Amino acid sequence: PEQTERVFQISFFNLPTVHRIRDIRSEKIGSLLSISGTVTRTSEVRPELYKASFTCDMCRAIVDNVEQSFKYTEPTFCPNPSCENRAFWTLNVTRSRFLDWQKVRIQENANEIPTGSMPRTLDVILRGDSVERAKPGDRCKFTGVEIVVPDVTQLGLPGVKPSSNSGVTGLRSLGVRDLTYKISFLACHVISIGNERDQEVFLNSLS
Amino acid sequence: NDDDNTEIIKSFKNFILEFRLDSQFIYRDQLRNNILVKNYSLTVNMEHLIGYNEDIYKKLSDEPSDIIPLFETAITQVAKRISILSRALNSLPTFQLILNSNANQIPLRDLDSEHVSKIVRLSGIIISTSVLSSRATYLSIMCRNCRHTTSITINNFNSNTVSLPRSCLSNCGPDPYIIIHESSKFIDQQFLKLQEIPELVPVGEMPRNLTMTCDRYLTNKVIPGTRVTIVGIYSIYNSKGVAIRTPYIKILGIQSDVETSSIWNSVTMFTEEEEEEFLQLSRNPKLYEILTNSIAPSIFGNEDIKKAIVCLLMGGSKKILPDGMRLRGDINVLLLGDPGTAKSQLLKFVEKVSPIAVYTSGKGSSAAGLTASVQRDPMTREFYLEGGAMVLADGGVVCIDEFDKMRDEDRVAIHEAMEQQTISIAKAGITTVLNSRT
Amino acid sequence: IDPLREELTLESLSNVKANSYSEWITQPNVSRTIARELKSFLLEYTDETGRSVYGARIRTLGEMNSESLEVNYRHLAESKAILALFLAKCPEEMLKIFDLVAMEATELHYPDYARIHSEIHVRISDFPTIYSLRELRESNLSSLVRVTGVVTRRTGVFPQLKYVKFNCLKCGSILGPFFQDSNEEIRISFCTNCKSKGPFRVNGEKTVYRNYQRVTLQEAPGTVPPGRLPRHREVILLADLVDVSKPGEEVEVTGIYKNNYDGNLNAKNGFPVFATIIEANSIKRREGNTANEGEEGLDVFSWTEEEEREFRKISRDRGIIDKIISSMAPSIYGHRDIKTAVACSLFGGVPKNVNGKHSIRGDINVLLLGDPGTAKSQILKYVEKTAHRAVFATGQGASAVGLTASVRKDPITKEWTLEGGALVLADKGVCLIDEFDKMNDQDRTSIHEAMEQQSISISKAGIVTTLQARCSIIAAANPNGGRYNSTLPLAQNVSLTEPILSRFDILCVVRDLVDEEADERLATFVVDSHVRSHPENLNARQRRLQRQRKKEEEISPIPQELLMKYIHYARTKIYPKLHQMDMDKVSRVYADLRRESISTGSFPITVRHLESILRIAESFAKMRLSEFVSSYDLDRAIKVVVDSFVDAQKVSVRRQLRRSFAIYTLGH
DNA sequence: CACACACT
DNA sequence: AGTGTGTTTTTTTTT
Numbered sequence A: 001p002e003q004t005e006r007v008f009q010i011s012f013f014n015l016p017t018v019h020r021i022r023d024i025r026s027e028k029i030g031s032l033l034s035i036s037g038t039v040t041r042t043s044e045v046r047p048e049l050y051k052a053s054f055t056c057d058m059c060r061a062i063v064d065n066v067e068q069s070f071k072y073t074e075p076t077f078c079p080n081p082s083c084e085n086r087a088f089w090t091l092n093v094t095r096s097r098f099l100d101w102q103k104v105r106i107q108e109n110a111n112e113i114p115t116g117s118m119p120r121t122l123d124v125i126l127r128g129d130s131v132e133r134a135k136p137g138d139r140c141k142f143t144g145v146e147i148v149v150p151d152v153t154q155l156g157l158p159g160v161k162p163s164s165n166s167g168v169t170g171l172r173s174l175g176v177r178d179l180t181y182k183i184s185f186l187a188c189h190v191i192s193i194g195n196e197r198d199q200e201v202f203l204n205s206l207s
Numbered sequence B: 001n002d003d004d005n006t007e008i009i010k011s012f013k014n015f016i017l018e019f020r021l022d023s024q025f026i027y028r029d030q031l032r033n034n035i036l037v038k039n040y041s042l043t044v045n046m047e048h049l050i051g052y053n054e055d056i057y058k059k060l061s062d063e064p065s066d067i068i069p070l071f072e073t074a075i076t077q078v079a080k081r082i083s084i085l086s087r088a089l090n091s092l093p094t095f096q097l098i099l100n101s102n103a104n105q106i107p108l109r110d111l112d113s114e115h116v117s118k119i120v121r122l123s124g125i126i127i128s129t130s131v132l133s134s135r136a137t138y139l140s141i142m143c144r145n146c147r148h149t150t151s152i153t154i155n156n157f158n159s160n161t162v163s164l165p166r167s168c169l170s171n172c173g174p175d176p177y178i179i180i181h182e183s184s185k186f187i188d189q190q191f192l193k194l195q196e197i198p199e200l201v202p203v204g205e206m207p208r209n210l211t212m213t214c215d216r217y218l219t220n221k222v223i224p225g226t227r228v229t230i231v232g233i234y235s236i237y238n239s240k241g242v243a244i245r246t247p248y249i250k251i252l253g254i255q256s257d258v259e260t261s262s263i264w265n266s267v268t269m270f271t272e273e274e275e276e277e278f279l280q281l282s283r284n285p286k287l288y289e290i291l292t293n294s295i296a297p298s299i300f301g302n303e304d305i306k307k308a309i310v311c312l313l314m315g316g317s318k319k320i321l322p323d324g325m326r327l328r329g330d331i332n333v334l335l336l337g338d339p340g341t342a343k344s345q346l347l348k349f350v351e352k353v354s355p356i357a358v359y360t361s362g363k364g365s366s367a368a369g370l371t372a373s374v375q376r377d378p379m380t381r382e383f384y385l386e387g388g389a390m391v392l393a394d395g396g397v398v399c400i401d402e403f404d405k406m407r408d409e410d411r412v413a414i415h416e417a418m419e420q421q422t423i424s425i426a427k428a429g430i431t432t433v434l435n436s437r438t
Numbered sequence C: 001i002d003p004l005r006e007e008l009t010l011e012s013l014s015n016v017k018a019n020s021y022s023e024w025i026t027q028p029n030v031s032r033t034i035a036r037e038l039k040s041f042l043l044e045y046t047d048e049t050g051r052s053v054y055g056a057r058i059r060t061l062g063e064m065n066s067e068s069l070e071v072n073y074r075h076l077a078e079s080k081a082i083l084a085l086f087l088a089k090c091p092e093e094m095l096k097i098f099d100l101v102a103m104e105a106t107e108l109h110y111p112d113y114a115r116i117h118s119e120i121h122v123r124i125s126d127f128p129t130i131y132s133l134r135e136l137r138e139s140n141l142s143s144l145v146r147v148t149g150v151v152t153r154r155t156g157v158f159p160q161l162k163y164v165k166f167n168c169l170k171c172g173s174i175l176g177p178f179f180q181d182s183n184e185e186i187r188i189s190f191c192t193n194c195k196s197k198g199p200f201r202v203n204g205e206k207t208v209y210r211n212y213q214r215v216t217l218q219e220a221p222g223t224v225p226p227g228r229l230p231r232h233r234e235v236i237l238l239a240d241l242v243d244v245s246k247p248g249e250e251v252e253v254t255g256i257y258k259n260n261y262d263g264n265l266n267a268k269n270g271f272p273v274f275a276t277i278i279e280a281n282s283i284k285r286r287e288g289n290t291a292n293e294g295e296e297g298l299d300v301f302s303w304t305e306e307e308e309r310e311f312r313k314i315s316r317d318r319g320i321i322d323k324i325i326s327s328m329a330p331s332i333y334g335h336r337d338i339k340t341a342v343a344c345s346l347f348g349g350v351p352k353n354v355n356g357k358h359s360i361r362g363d364i365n366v367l368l369l370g371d372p373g374t375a376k377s378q379i380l381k382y383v384e385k386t387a388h389r390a391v392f393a394t395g396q397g398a399s400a401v402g403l404t405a406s407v408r409k410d411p412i413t414k415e416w417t418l419e420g421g422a423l424v425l426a427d428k429g430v431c432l433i434d435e436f437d438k439m440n441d442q443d444r445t446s447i448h449e450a451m452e453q454q455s456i457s458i459s460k461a462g463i464v465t466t467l468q469a470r471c472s473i474i475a476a477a478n479p480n481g482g483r484y485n486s487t488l489p490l491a492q493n494v495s496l497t498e499p500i501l502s503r504f505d506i507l508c509v510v511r512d513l514v515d516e517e518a519d520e521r522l523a524t525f526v527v528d529s530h531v532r533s534h535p536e537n538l539n540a541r542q543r544r545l546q547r548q549r550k551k552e553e554e555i556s557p558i559p560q561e562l563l564m565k566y567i568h569y570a571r572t573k574i575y576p577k578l579h580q581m582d583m584d585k586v587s588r589v590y591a592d593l594r595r596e597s598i599s600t601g602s603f604p605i606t607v608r609h610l611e612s613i614l615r616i617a618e619s620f621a622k623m624r625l626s627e628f629v630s631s632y633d634l635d636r637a638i639k640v641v642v643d644s645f646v647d648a649q650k651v652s653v654r655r656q657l658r659r660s661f662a663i664y665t666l667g668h
Numbered sequence D: 001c002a003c004a005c006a007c008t
Numbered sequence E: 001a002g003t004g005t006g007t008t009t010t011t012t013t014t015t
């Protein structure tokens, strides 16, 4: 198991400008932004599958590292070009890759808002190290990539009902029902923006 | 095996026709009885079945679910053979089987994931009874475009239900056979809920309840709040959580754990004899003092008090005048005195003597709607009328505790109800009036 | 060596020599070698004993006729540990292998014990690491680990399809039975007869059914950092394992970290989140005391037949009653009469029933009046943990609905549901009552009602249920102003109702008297309590142990655990009977009781007081532990009750009454 | 029951 | 072209 590559996460500390709850416009997509959010509710740890395997028993062939954007997505066909099947795919839970995630939402503070704006809550993506790094109920200084998050149930994946806006022509990735979005941020690094009563511990720890 | 199944049916009819004791074939006896009074139902004891033939009983125990319909068919054929002249569907309704086990009763608590679809013997107290629900014994259908009309005779012995017919079956569609609900013959079913053995008192465990079903000659036999020793097959169906389905019971026999007889329809189970000695006790004036002394054991006296109690329990006669008026029969006795004087004890004893009403307490009884509370039904936002104590006490001599401790204001609402001998409610836009003979 | 079903050396078995660990374990050759080693150490490996403790559990569970097969996870790492690591990494397959080896051991120790349980479970007790819900990482997935949670749901136990046979409507009448994970639908969606997709239905052929009980878990708030919401992971109980607990009782268990899919979770989250479960291979409660081995496993306390022989031996020893009086709450110096009362309440009277319906309570309602700071709450705390089944009533905190009987509207089920009445919790055990003289009066009347019948009857919100309440209760009260005035009548010293003191069989009053040398002893005694309480002082702990041993010698000669087991033995087997009695002694007693209530300092004496005396006699006889009541023990019961009555009187009449009863007092 | 979608 | 699937605050009642 050690041979299997351990995924890379690169957290950015000491970033020049902190945009805080302000800024965060649409023109920037996939952009590195530093936000001084006041995250007091956070979320629960979530497995957040990264990659996985598929059985596709009737071809007997096996995928490797299936990636899905936001909704559980299956291979386009059976891994074997023979018995290529757009009808059936079954998970093989073999290439299972997971990143402990916590949908932390940040409510804006009281200061730095001119006119009593409500504590606007923006969910922020969190990583397993970041989840443990982040202490909930505490306002945090954090930065990371600002990605466009689509609205839920929009994909025509099986099980989840597709969300039946304006769209382009010439696309064929999703020809019908269009799609709608609700952007959320991803923070690569997070820091908080805002005992030991034993004789041996006292002697060793104290200067 | 269908021929083998018919052979098993023949074996069962050989059982019933040639099982006798002292030359007496009890089965044909109850058969002719159920012919004279047309109850298409038959009672059998499995001990008798084992005595006649173990093998048939074992086949029963293997999978009763489908053995029972064969037995019902056998009984129906037997009734046709006996009660109908030779060479003379729905012409004769099918008889249904009644069984008494006398085996051990597994508690409702600690029932296993095993015993699925297995005949079991239990006991519990009813907490709720469902209204009647018809069941398609016979089904009348027509093939829509094909116009083909056919008969279906579905039994309630599977699982859930049989799906509607598919294809033409001699395209007419995935369900051409549209049910015409006129020739189709139905039998009512009733759902039951048993509390687990109030005597078992599983310490710290909320009493689990299971659902049941009853057939036309089983439904409405007993009321809620009454304990019954049941003999019915353990039953499972899907409510709509993986591979878990609703546990319930399909009953093959009903016996009263409380053992109390049903609503007395004046049929004298005491018969002429017991009532004859009852009148003899009435004939002998000394027996009045006998009843007086017998009431309230260990009380040490208070005999005139006991006489008053006996008279009250005895029931004052309600005379209905030719006028719109009507003489008020029942009376309510008032108990005032020093505490620790067995007064509440005597009340409890008297209520135990006469269960036509229910012992309660003021604080224990809901202040609102003591006579009859109004509650919002879970599936109807309208606040329905729930029967309060004096609804239950109606038709019964009732004892209640802590009158003084009770809030006075609603006790005012009690005197009017007892005075009128009814309970008139116009609250919440609902003008129902219920009798209070207590 | 074989490609499948092989036997190899332990070392070649240990190293996967393959890219994937789980794939290497997947080889049935490796599995069979592990099976050989498993059977080998199961009986052959007799750790620390001449006999294999696992073999001892075998045919003992056979005698128990159960399916668990507890392992303790020890003697596994101790037995070459490769199997231990293999289990810790990829359990499920070698759990199945353990079930097989259980089969062979089964038919070995007990032939024909097969077909009793078609399977024999694995029960992995204990674990190297306790872990936390905050500790659950993607590494922890699909690995059995001990956890630290609080049971919350305990859903209705449901039989679940151990095997499932899926068949299509058109082609397959019956298809082969395949195992069901009970976590999600198998949904094969393929017919052996029809290659094309078709409508599928379950097969009517019967397959095995196993119990199913879902429970929500919760991290311990004390262990949880402040201000942090504990995580909640779902756990499902299975057959031979369901109904092991009570909701909120809280447990630590080792189980595989199941992971499942559900599209609704992704929808509400907008992300490829995957639903995670655990189902403990073995269950053990976490009561939270962690004092001893009782914490491990389920519940606490014990019962020993050697202990009951000791109880018999002390029972025939005389002076046992006085030792018990000294035994109850030794940490409260003095209060000899109070100790007597509370101890006999712990023993409790003999329940009596007449004609089936007429009944007499076997429980004792102690009324205590105590000055503030008189250990009343601490007396109650010593009382509890001594009578096993116990409850505490804060008095002011509880109410009429809360303590006696409560109904709770349940939005999740959509109907009114019963809420646990704390007095129902009192039922079957001792009932502690505190701060009662200050709490609500309507609640007091509710308690009166409940105690009168030893049962609580509630008819509201469509719930007409009635619950038995068999509980020996002990009310704690403070005098008017905290100080009882002996010259003042008791009723004037009491801010509560007359009827409640009437229904109370035992009255207790605490007063402050001169007791100088006694106050010396009491202050010294509290100093000693502090000193033994202080960790800072063979060693210091040894001298603390020896001083508590000697104090146990003077007071509480029986050990407190031995004491509570003595009480358990008394309730379980001892049932003293009034076969012999003194009718006219009690007659003259109640006669003297009369024409005394005429005194302004005297409360009325009624029949229930006499029944109280009778049940005090029963409690004394149970305290004597003889199966037959003793006349003179009953005499001491009379003495205690009459002394309580005399104390209840005004001091002015109290002296005249004590002279009058002196004709009774000397007989004791 | 029975008619717009999404491929069948 | 197969065949599947979806639409009908108030007011007592506690307390």
Ligand SMILES: Nc1ncnc2c1ncn2[C@@H]1O[C@H](COP(=O)(O)OP(=O)(O)OP(O)(O)=S)[C@@H](O)[C@H]1O
Pocket (backbone or CB within 6 Å): B298, B299, B300, B338, B339, B340, B341, B342, B343, B344, B345, B346, C452, C499, C503, C607, C608, C611
């Ligand atoms: N005359 C009597 N004969 C026999 N037992 C009696 C007598 N008077 C009182 N008792 C006993 O004293 C107990 C006290 O009565 P309870 O059943 O508690 O109810 P109660 O007499 O109504 O008391 P209150 O007023 O409710 S506190 C009775 O249960 C009897 O066991």
Ligand SMILES: Nc1ncnc2c1ncn2[C@@H]1O[C@H](COP(=O)(O)OP(=O)(O)O)[C@@H](O)[C@H]1O
Pocket (backbone or CB within 6 Å): C331, C332, C333, C334, C335, C370, C371, C372, C373, C374, C375, C376, C377, C378, C379, C522, C526
């Ligand atoms: N005789 C005694 N021996 C030892 N401690 C005692 C004694 N009497 C009172 N105490 C102490 O008094 C304290 C107060 O007890 P508590 O019941 O809480 O008081 P209150 O009387 O205010 O209800 C306890 O900590 C207990 O140890």
Ligand SMILES: [Mg+2]
Pocket (backbone or CB within 6 Å): B343, B344, B401, B402, C452
């Ligand atoms: Mg009373």
Ligand SMILES: [Mg+2]
Pocket (backbone or CB within 6 Å): C375, C376, C377, C378, C434
């Ligand atoms: Mg206290």
Ligand SMILES: [Zn+2]
Pocket (backbone or CB within 6 Å): A056, A057, A058, A059, A060, A078, A080, A082, A083, A084, A085
């Ligand atoms: Zn394929």
Ligand SMILES: [Zn+2]
Pocket (backbone or CB within 6 Å): B143, B145, B146, B147, B148, B167, B168, B169, B170, B172, B176
């Ligand atoms: Zn047709």
Ligand SMILES: [Zn+2]
Pocket (backbone or CB within 6 Å): C168, C170, C171, C172, C191, C192, C193, C194, C195, C198
């Ligand atoms: Zn098929």
